[PDB]
From a paper:
In addition, both the structures of PacT homologues from P. jinjuensis and P. flexibilis are in complex with AcCoA, and share similar fold with PacT in superposition (mean RMSD 0.28Å). Because GNAT-Xre toxins are widespread in Pseudomonas species, which also have highly conserved Fur proteins, we also tested the binding between GNAT toxins and Fur proteins from P. jinjuensis and P. flexibilis. Consistently, both PacT homologs could specifically bind to the DNA-binding domain of Fur. We also found that PacT homologs from other Pseudomonas species could bind to the Fur protein, suggesting that the direct PacT–Fur interaction is a common mechanism for PacT-type toxins. Based on these results, we conclude that the specific interactions between GNAT-Xre toxins and Fur proteins seem to be a common and novel bidirectional regulatory mechanism, indicating that Fur proteins play vital roles in bacterial iron uptake.
Numbering used by the authors:
A (entry chain A): 5 to 189
B (entry chain B): 2 to 189
The structure:
């Protein structure tokens, strides 16, 4: 079920139709940085996420920094029998790269999934050509499970592999510690 | 790619669209084959079939019944469609014990992979199975599918126990060799 997460200036809130135009304008202003994503420039990428929420398939979130939209992220691919899910669909405007915002986002969402949803597995995947995203994920301590061939298209249509990672509930203390270590340097 | 229902045929072997009327016989046969189905989640649960039939309405799965001489002998399905690529999974496969090692699996996979790669023009077909299920692993390896890795805490076994998944796939560039190896095992 839907949730709103916050930590200081950062707020993760359910995505609504009213957010779509500002997200698309921001993505297009940041198009260079978003080349590894599928279609961040398309309104229907955001609306399909809102529709997926209706069908219980996704929880799309808008990232606000001091009340300003700076990007998006989402829970998806729920496996209720386990329970397990994915954090995916993440992007931030360039000026937030390196600022610790991703780490705060991942901490809030991962804490929710493990502590509140009692997940046994949270997975994350990224393009094999997207080295900065791989490093961000590796910094979490997520375990690299393998390379999935022909598993995504990049923004300009090119086929790429995906790298798949996960974190188990057993591993959560480890990951929580590493994120909290970053908060405080 | 359009996820439309199809019948696939080879000799006396037919893969036919699964329908509601089939579910009781499937569940009855799975119950008679409990011992061989212990690594799957829910082959003995009618809802596992019903759910795929429902998902087909929305384009998200194509469940199939395996008939040999018009006799139900097991099941398999296409699922996890990725339309942008396009890509899919072959999963939910089981046969009654009496058909293990009798060549039906290779025929079924040839038919499904041919549809996926030649008609749907897929770039990726994936297959996955429990880390505990070594017979399935060896049968997927015999196809030539490439082992991509182990997914932790990713499934439950029939009785409820958490296990890992081994994930494999076949790409469009690998299909020609997969197809030819399968045909090297067939007559004509
Ligand atoms: C950048 C983004 C992933 C969010 O994270 P972020 O704040 O940049 O993350 P980080 O700050 O930890 O930076 C990532 C790292 O990449 C490093 N980096 C990695 N590969 C590099 C390379 N080839 N060249 C130069 N620098 C590289 C950077 O030094 C940095 O790591 P560091 O802290 O060790 O110095 C994301 O918004 C993005 O902009 N677009 C695509 C999103 C995506 O990939 N989604 C996949 C599914 S969610
Ligand atoms: C998965 C399945 C369709 C494979 O069909 P099959 O006809 O049994 O496949 P094969 O006999 O060609 O291959 C299995 C291989 O593993 C061998 N094998 C059998 N038991 C084994 C075991 N515990 N450990 C390792 N290998 C084993 C078989 O001898 C054979 O190898 P070989 O032909 O080289 O000698 C069938 O076994 C089945 O329905 N199993 C129960 C349902 C199931 O588990 N499905 C998994 C869904 S992912």
């Amino acid at each position: 079920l839907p949730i709103t997460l916050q930590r200081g200036a950062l707020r993760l809130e359910p995505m609504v139709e009213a957010d779509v135009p500002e997200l698309v304008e921001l993505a297009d202003a940041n198009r260079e940085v978003l080349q590894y994503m599928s279609a961040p420039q398309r309104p229907d990428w955001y609306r399909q996420a809102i529709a997926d929420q209706r069908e219980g398939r996704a929880l799309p979130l808008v990232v606000r920094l001091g009340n300003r939209i700076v990007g998006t992220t989402r829970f998806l691919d729920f496996m209720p029998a386990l329970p397990a899910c994915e954090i995916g669909g993440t992007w931030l405007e360039q000026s937030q790269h390196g600022m610790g915002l991703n780490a705060s986002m991942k901490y809030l969402m991962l804490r929710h999934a493990f502590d509140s949803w009692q997940m046994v597995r949270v997975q994350l995947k990224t393009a094999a050509s997207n080295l900065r995203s791989q490093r961000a994920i590796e910094k979490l301590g997520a375990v690299r499970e393998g390379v999935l061939r022909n598993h995504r298209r990049l923004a300009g249509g090119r086929l790429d592999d995906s790298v798949l990672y996960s974190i188990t509930d057993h591993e959560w203390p480890q990951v929580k510690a590493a994120l909290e270590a970053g908060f405080s340097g």
